[PDB]
């Protein structure tokens, strides 16, 4: 008989992107279970690194080496930062916020913390100011295929001298060629970094009117990238859930074996 | 005149642990501002690494090298995990949970996710199963000096063969000697790892009755460490806020300059 849709769903959980119709479900399942167990055994025997942790470390090295200061700022942030980012009821993002208690939320972006860092560090560091952060961000989402409610963002941000669209495109290009991820840049000045139909990043050239609220009055360039989206593309995952912080997948391998 | 308490508070913000009464406040402040700006300039010119990020990477290397699998699991977890951990109204922890929506919370510990990992991985990996995770945890706290509401925990956990108190003490000892942090181990079997009066870690030898709820029926050893507490001790910070994810301190240096 033909496989049921439920059975095909089960096999797809166990199917790996580079895996290469008369056998019963039971046999196809046993074969895939055996392969995935071996995949996990090989990781455990050899590298033992988590893809999301490893990518964070690789990205950190890239930016530290190119003169950007590594920031680790709060994940739980004041709700006032959302309003101050110009996120009112007119915008999509207002309905995407995870509130915590009466005064806090889970950050949906790194931007407000990093605005504060740029303003503070400008009192201490030589121009240009170059900073980056990688860490958890949270948004309520409808979509499942390219969106996670708990994801990981990289932002890099330069302020002062050399903040041109050309230099922004150069950093993006060097970065993605370093990772081995194909892309196209599609065009304050605003740029989208695409992999086919998937947005890997939004990038911007300042100044913009919002800067004044944060005490910023210098030119700047920066961009935000989703790490799970980078992993999805690099590893050819069909669904972004394979790249997420998860109890269901480890390095894109089902843990339900 | 004598410095006011407010003025002394201000200078203490700018004071560094290894910094070595007739000058006015204005002069003491200028001197300390100059020193802290230089400290930040030196970081920016040279290493550019954040202490919390760097410590996470150092700890990751230590455990990966000693055969532990690196886990990155969800930070936003089901509220049901709290109840299933035996955290009812009789316990301190029940009142410390940050709830999110109706069904979720910010994890106050890594334990429930890692219990699920141990059960799942036991179907795939050879005995013993050795895993670890480092990442954000959240607890409502009264205390300010040794507690943060947003902190970072390491848990390592071995299950199966070799799960003895001796092997647990050995891992802890090798780990803290590797980091260069002084400690005493004070004594399921339960151990506390102390630095003077400060608890760096709680460690346990299983089995315990709770294991059954999570589908675990093997011996185990493990321990949980606060990264900000390790940093506080290593860098001789008077207050743990200097070691936190923060907008107010960077590598223990005031950003309010
Ligand atoms: N829910 C999510 N899950 C995974 N990655 C995300 C999510 N939201 C944003 N990102 C990533 O973070 C980057 C910068 O965020 P931002 O520019 O605010 O995204 P966005 O405009 O909401 N993109 P999209 O929702 O795909 O139209 C995006 O380009 C994505 O790579
Ligand atoms: N609020 C906090 N801030 C910083 N570190 C913490 C916090 N809570 C726990 N830790 C660290 O995480 C480790 C393991 O957590 P756990 O054993 O649950 O702590 P605890 O028993 O609540 N300790 P304490 O609250 O100091 O009595 C502790 O030994 C600390 O190093
Ligand atoms: C500094 O430059 C940027 C920073 C972040 C982003 C992504 C998104 N607009 C956000 O604010 O998260 C885009 C550009
Ligand atoms: C696997 O062994 C341990 C794991 C975690 C801890 C700290 C605390 N009891 C907690 O559950 O977070 C102590 C031991
Ligand atoms: Mg979106
Ligand atoms: Mg965008
Ligand atoms: Mg406590
Ligand atoms: Mg304890």
Coordinates of C-alpha atoms in Angstrom, one line a residue, chain B residues 17 53 73 82 113 163 201 239:
Chain B
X17 CA 39.4 46.3 42.1
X53 CA 30.9 35.7 26.2
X73 CA 17.8 24.4 24.4
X82 CA 8.1 23.9 36.7
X113 CA 15.3 20.7 29.3
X163 CA 28.6 8.4 38.2
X201 CA 27.6 25.7 42.6
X239 CA 29.0 43.7 43.3

